C-alpha cells in the first residue's frame, strides 16, 4: 500500500488533525455539496442551509465517529476489509448507501485536510491519502463484492 516515506508522511499529518472539528466539517460538507445524502439523516434535524448543517450538533457529533473509523483504518492499513466488516454490513446490508457515496466522503475529507493544512498538504501527501480513502471506501463496500 504505502511506501515507508508515504506511511510516515500520512501519520505525521494525521497527528495534527483536530479530532473535534475535522470529522464534523467533512460530513457537513458531504451533506451540503451532495444534498441527496441528507436523506439518510432525517433524524439529525435541521439541514436547510449550509450554516444550519455545519452548526448541527448531531452532524458534528456524528462526524467524530467517522474520523475515528478512519483513524482505525490507518492503524490497520493491511487489514481494512475486516476492520470495517461490521461497518460494511451496517452501511451495505442495513442502510443500502450506494457505495459511490463512500468515495464522495473520502474525497471531501481530503478537501477538508487540504483546507486545514494549506501548503503542508503537498501533492505527495495527498497521493498517499487518496490511497487510504480508496482503501476505506473499498473495505466499506466489501459486502457488495
Amino acid at each position: 500500500h504505502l511506501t515507508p516515506v508515504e506511511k510516515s508522511a500520512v501519520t505525521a499529518l494525521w497527528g495534527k488533525v483536530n479530532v473535534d472539528e475535522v470529522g464534523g466539517e467533512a460530513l457537513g460538507r458531504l451533506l451540503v455539496v451532495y444534498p441527496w445524502t441528507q436523506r439518510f439523516f432525517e433524524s439529525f434535524g435541521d439541514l436547510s442551509t449550509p450554516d444550519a448543517v455545519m452548526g448541527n450538533p448531531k452532524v458534528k457529533a456524528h462526524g467524530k465517529k467517522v474520523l475515528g473509523a478512519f483513524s482505525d483504518g490507518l492503524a490497520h492499513l493491511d487489514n481494512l476489509k475486516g476492520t470495517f466488516a461490521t461497518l460494511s454490513e451496517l452501511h451495505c446490508d442495513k442502510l443500502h448507501v450506494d457505495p459511490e457515496n463512500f468515495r464522495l466522503l473520502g474525497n471531501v475529507l481530503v478537501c477538508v485536510l487540504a483546507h486545514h493544512f494549506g501548503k503542508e498538504f503537498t501533492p505527495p501527501v495527498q497521493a498517499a491519502y487518496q490511497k487510504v480513502v480508496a482503501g476505506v471506501a473499498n473495505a466499506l463496500a466489501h459486502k457488495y463484492h
Binding site: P50, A114, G118, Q126
Partner: protein, 141 residues
C-alpha cells in the same frame, strides 16, 4: 444546473484566484498525476517530472479555459465548443478523469484560498466544474 447563488460564488471565488490561476492549474495537474497515475496516459508526450515546464504551461491553458468558462457560465456549450471537440471527439476522455481533475482543483483551491472555500462555495465550485466536465465530454456537434 447552476443556481443564481452558485454563479456569483464561482465568479467571486475565481476573481480571488487572480494571477495565480496558472499556478493553481499546474498544481491541480501535478496532484492529479500523482494521486491518479492512470491519468498520465493521456499525456504520453508530456514531460511529467516534478516542476515540468510542459506541465506548467498546460496548467495555464486549463486555468485560462476555466476562466473563459466562468465568464460565459450561462452559455458554456457555445463558449467551450472548441474544447468539447478536442476532449470528446478527438481525445475521447473518460468522464471519470474529469472528476479526478475537478477534485484536485478543489483540493488546490482549498489549500490556497482557505477563506474563500466555505461549504456553500465548495458546493458551487463542485457544480461549476461538473458542468464544465459535462460540456467537455459531450459530443454536441
Amino acid at each position: 444546473v447552476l443556481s443564481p447563488a452558485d454563479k456569483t460564488n464561482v465568479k467571486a471565488a475565481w476573481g480571488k484566484v487572480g494571477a495565480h490561476a496558472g499556478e493553481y492549474g499546474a498544481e491541480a495537474l501535478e496532484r492529479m498525476f500523482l494521486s491518479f497515475p492512470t491519468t498520465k496516459t493521456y499525456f504520453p508526450h508530456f514531460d511529467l517530472s516534478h516542476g515540468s515546464a510542459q506541465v506548467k504551461g498546460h496548467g495555464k491553458k486549463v486555468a485560462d479555459a476555466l476562466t473563459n468558462a466562468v465568464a460565459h457560465v450561462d452559455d458554456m456549450p457555445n463558449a467551450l465548443s472548441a474544447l468539447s471537440d478536442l476532449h470528446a471527439h478527438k481525445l475521447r476522455v473518460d468522464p471519470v478523469n474529469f472528476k479526478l481533475l475537478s477534485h484536485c482543483l478543489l483540493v488546490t483551491l482549498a489549500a490556497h484560498l482557505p477563506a474563500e472555500f466555505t461549504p456553500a462555495v465548495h458546493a458551487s465550485l463542485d457544480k461549476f466544474l461538473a458542468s464544465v466536465s459535462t460540456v467537455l465530454t459531450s459530443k454536441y456537434r
